[PDB]
Amino acid sequence: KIKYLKDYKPSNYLIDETHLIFELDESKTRVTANLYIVANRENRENNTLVLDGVELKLLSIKLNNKHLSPAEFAVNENQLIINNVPEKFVLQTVVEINPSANTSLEGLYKSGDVFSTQCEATGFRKITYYLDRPDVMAAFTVKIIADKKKYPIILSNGDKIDSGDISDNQHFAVWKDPFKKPCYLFALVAGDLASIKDTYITKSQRKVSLEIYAFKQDIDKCHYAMQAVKDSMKWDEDRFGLEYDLDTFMIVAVPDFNAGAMENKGLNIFNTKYIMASNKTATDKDFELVQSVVGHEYFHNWTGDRVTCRDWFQLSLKEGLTVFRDQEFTSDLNSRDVKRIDDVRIIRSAQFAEDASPMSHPIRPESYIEMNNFYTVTVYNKGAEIIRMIHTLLGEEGFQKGMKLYFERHDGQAVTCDDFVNAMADANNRDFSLFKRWYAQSGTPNIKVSENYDASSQTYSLTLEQTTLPTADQKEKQALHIPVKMGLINPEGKNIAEQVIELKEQKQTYTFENIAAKPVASLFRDFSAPVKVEHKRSEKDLLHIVKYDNNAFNRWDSLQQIATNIILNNADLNDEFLNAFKSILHDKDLDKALISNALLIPIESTIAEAMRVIMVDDIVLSRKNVVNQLADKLKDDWLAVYQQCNDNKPYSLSAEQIAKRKLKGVCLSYLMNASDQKVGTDLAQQLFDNADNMTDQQTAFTELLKSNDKQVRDNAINEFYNRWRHEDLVVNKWLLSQAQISHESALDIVKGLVNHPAYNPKNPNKVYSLIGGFGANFLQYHCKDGLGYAFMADTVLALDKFNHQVAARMARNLMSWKRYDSDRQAMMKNALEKIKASNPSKNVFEIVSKSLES
Ligand SMILES: [Cl-]
Ligand SMILES: [Cl-]
Ligand SMILES: [Cl-]
Ligand SMILES: [Cl-]
Ligand SMILES: [Cl-]
Ligand SMILES: [Cl-]
Ligand SMILES: [Cl-]
Ligand SMILES: [Cl-]
Ligand SMILES: [Cl-]
Ligand SMILES: [Cl-]
Ligand SMILES: [Cl-]
Ligand SMILES: [Cl-]
Ligand SMILES: [Cl-]
Ligand SMILES: [Cl-]
Ligand SMILES: [Cl-]
Ligand code: NA
Ligand SMILES: [Zn+2]
Question: What is the Cα–Cα distance from 836 to 841, expressed in whole angstroms?
Answer: 10
- Sequence-ordered list of residues with C-beta below 8 angstroms from that of 433, at least 6 positions apart, any chain: none
Q: How was this structure determined?
A: X-ray
Q: What is the DSSP letter of 428?
A: T
Q: Which amino acid is at 437?
A: R
- DSSP sequence for 27-65: S-EEEEEEEEEEE-TT--S---EEEE--S-EEEEEEETT
Q: In the β-sheet with 446-454, what is the strand arrangement from edge to edge?
A: 507-512, 459-467, 446-454, 532-534
Q: How far apart are CA 734 and CA 728, in angstroms?
A: 10
How many residues appear in the chain? 854
- The answer to whether residues 376 and 354 touch, using CB atoms and an 8 Å cutoff, is yes
Q: How far is CA 400 from the centre of its chain?
A: 24
> How far, in whole angstroms, is CA 705 from its chain's centroid?
30
- The amino acid that residue 750 corresponds to is V
In 3D, which of 758, 700, 692 has the Cα closest to residue 730? 758
DSSP assignment of 163-196 equals EEEETTTEEEEEEEEEEEEEGGG--EEEE--EEE
Catalytic residue among 297, 354, 385, 604: 297
Interatomic CA distance for residues 600 and 623, integer angstroms:
11
What is the rounded CA–CA span in Å between residue 600 and residue 563?
A: 10
The alpha carbon of 423 and the centre of ligand 6 are apart by a number of angstroms equal to: 9
Is 139 in contact with 99 (CB distance < 8 Å)? no
Whether 442 and 360 have beta carbons less than 8 Å apart is answered as yes
In this structure, which ligand is nearest to the CA of 18? 16
* DSSP per residue, 486-524: EEEE-TT--EEEEEEEEE-SSEEEEEE----S--EEE-S
User: Which residues keep their CB under 5 angstroms from ion ligand 7?
Assistant: 451, 453
How many angstroms is it from 164 CA to the middle of ligand 4?
A: 8
**Could you give phi then psi for residue 162, rounded to 5 degrees?**
-160, 150
Sign of the CA dihedral running 124, 130, 136, 137:
negative
Contact 653, 231 (CB under 8 A): no
Return d(Cα 356, Cα 711) in angstroms, integer: 46
The residue among 236, 152, 153 whose CA lies nearest residue 200 is: 236
Terminal CA-to-CA distance of the chain, rounded, Å? 24
**Whether 584 contacts 598, CB under 8 Å:** yes
CA–CA gap between residue 647 and residue 656 (Å, rounded): 12
Element (H, E) at 141: strand 137-147
Positive or negative: CA dihedral 388, 393, 396, 397: negative
| Number of Cβ atoms within 10 Å of the Cβ of 778 | 20
| Catalytic (active site) residue 328 | no
**Distance from the alpha carbon of residue 468 to the mean position of ligand 8, in angstroms:** 5
Q: Is 264 strand, coil or helix?
A: coil
- Cα distance between residue 782 and residue 616, in whole Å: 7
Which of the listed CATH numbers 1.10.10.60, 3.30.2010.30, 3.90.1150.180, 3.30.70.260 matches domain 194-278? 3.30.2010.30
**Alpha carbons 791 and 777: distance in angstroms, whole number:** 13
Closest-approaching ligand to the CA atom of 823 = 12
Contact criterion met (CB below 8 Å) for 556 and 597: yes
Delimiting residues of CATH 2.60.40.1840 domain(s) in the chain: 443-536
Q: Whole-angstrom Cα distance, residue 545 to residue 521?
A: 8
Determine contact, residues 274/261, Cβ cutoff 8 Å.
Answer: yes
> Phi/psi of residue 89, each to 5°?
-160, 165
> How far is 50 from 32, CA to CA, in rounded Å?
18
The residue type at 246: L
CATH architecture, domain defined by 10-193: Sandwich (2.60)
Closest C-alpha among 542, 538, 543, 536 to residue 576: 543
Measured CA to CA, the distance from residue 713 to residue 710 in angstroms comes to 5
Distance separating alpha carbons of residues 427 and 347, to the nearest angstrom: 29
Q: Which amino acid is at 501?
A: I
Residue at 302: amino acid letter: W
E strands, 167-313, are 170-182, 188-191, 194-201, 207-214, 248-254, 261-262, 267-271, 308-309
Nearest listed ligand to the Cα of residue 163: 4
CA distance 404 to 408: 6
Pairing mode, if any, of strands 29-39 and 153-156? unpaired
Cα–Cα distance, 526 to 396 (Å, whole number): 15
Helical H segments across 300-431, by residue range? 315-333, 336-346, 352-356, 377-410, 417-426
Cβ atoms of residues 728 and 715 within 8 Å: no
For residue 319, say whether it is annotated as part of any ligand binding site.
yes
> From the CA of 462, how far away is ligand 7's center (Å)?
8
Q: Which ligand is nearest to the CA of 684?
A: 13
Annotated binding residue 743: no
Question: Which ligand is located closest to the Cα atom of residue 476?
Answer: 8
Where b means 16+ CB within 10 Å and e means fewer, 543-552 reads bbbbbbbebb
Q: CA–CA separation, 230 vs 220, rounded Å? A: 18
| Span(s) in the chain for CATH 1.10.390.10 | 279-442
Peptide bond into 121 cis (omega under 30): yes
Contacts of 3 (CB under 8 A, 6+ apart): 367, 368, 369
For residue 739, the Cα-to-chain-centroid distance in whole angstroms is 25
Q: Is 671 exposed, middle or buried (0-12, 13-18, 19+ CB in 10 A)?
A: buried
| Environment class of 243 (CB within 10 Å of its CB; exposed 0-12, middle 13-18, buried 19+) | middle
Annotated resolution, angstroms: 2.5
Nearest CA among 720, 717, 707 for reference residue 678: 707
Residues with CB under 5 A from ligand 15 (ion): 761, 795, 798
**Cα–Cα distance list, 525 to 183, 276, 310 (Å):** 41, 36, 34
DSSP 589-630: SS-HHHHHHHHSPPPHHHHHTT-SSB-HHHHHHHHHHHHHHH
The three-class DSSP label of residue 653 is coil
| Residues 6+ positions from 671 with CB-CB distance below 8 Å | 631, 635, 638, 639, 642, 677, 679, 680, 683, 684, 703
301 touches 282 (CB < 8 A): no
Q: Pick from 420, 306, 279: which is nearest to 363 by CA? A: 420
* DSSP assignment string, 798-838: HHHHH-HHHHHHHHGGGTTGGGB-HHHHHHHHHHHHHHHTT
Distance 620 CA to ligand 12 centre (A): 9
Nearest of 655, 754, 18, 795 to residue 291 by alpha carbon: 655
Ligand 1 ion: residues within 5 Å (CB):
25-26
Distance CA 753, CA 717 (A): 12
Which CATH class name applies to 279-442?
Answer: mainly alpha
- Distance between CA 659 and CA 325 in Å, rounded? 23
Residues with CB under 5 A from ligand 5 (ion): 416
- Architecture of the domain whose range is 537-854: Alpha Horseshoe (1.25)
b (16+ CB within 10 A) / e for 106-145 = bbbbbbeebbbbbbbbbbbbbbbbbbbbbbbbbbbbbbbb
Phi, psi of 332 (to 5 degrees): -65, -50
For residues 109 and 95, what is the distance between their CA atoms, to the nearest angstrom? 15
**Cα 386 from chain centroid?**
16
Q: Report the candidate in 561, 502, 573 with the shortest Cα–Cα distance to residue 535.
A: 561
CA distance 741 to 703: 10
> Ligand 8 is a single-atom ion; what residues have CB below 5 A from it?
468, 477
d(CA 837, CA 854): 18
610 close to 565: Cβ distance less than 8 angstroms: no
What number does CATH give the domain 443-536?
2.60.40.1840
DSSP bridge partners of 449: 464
Q: Report the SS3 class of residue 230.
A: helix
Spacing, Cα 520 to ligand 7 middle (Å): 7
Question: Which strands, in side-by-side order, build the sheet including 79-82?
Answer: 49-52, 79-82, 74-75
87 in a known ligand binding site: no
Angstrom distance (rounded) from CA 631 to CA 407 = 54
CA distance 94 to 57: 9
Residue 46 Cα to ligand 14 middle (Å): 51
Q: Please state whether 304 falls in left (phi above 0), alpha (psi between -120 and 50) or beta.
A: left
Query: What are the start and end residues of each CATH 1.25.50.10 domain in the chain?
Result: 537-854
- Beta pairing partners, 162: 174
Q: Cβ–Cβ contacts within 10 Å for residue 258, how many?
A: 11
Asked whether the beta carbons of 12 and 40 are under 8 A apart, the reply is yes
Smallest CA-to-CA distance from 362 within 5, 791, 825, 41 is with: 5
Residue/partner pairs of 58-64 with CB below 8 Å, 24 or more apart? 58/93, 58/94, 58/95, 58/129, 59/30, 59/94, 59/95, 59/96, 60/92, 60/93, 60/94, 61/91, 61/92, 61/93, 61/94, 62/91, 62/92, 63/89, 63/90, 63/91, 63/92, 64/89, 64/90
648 CA distance to ligand 1 middle (Å): 55
From residue 360, alpha-carbon distances to 529, 533, 817 in Å are: 18, 20, 20
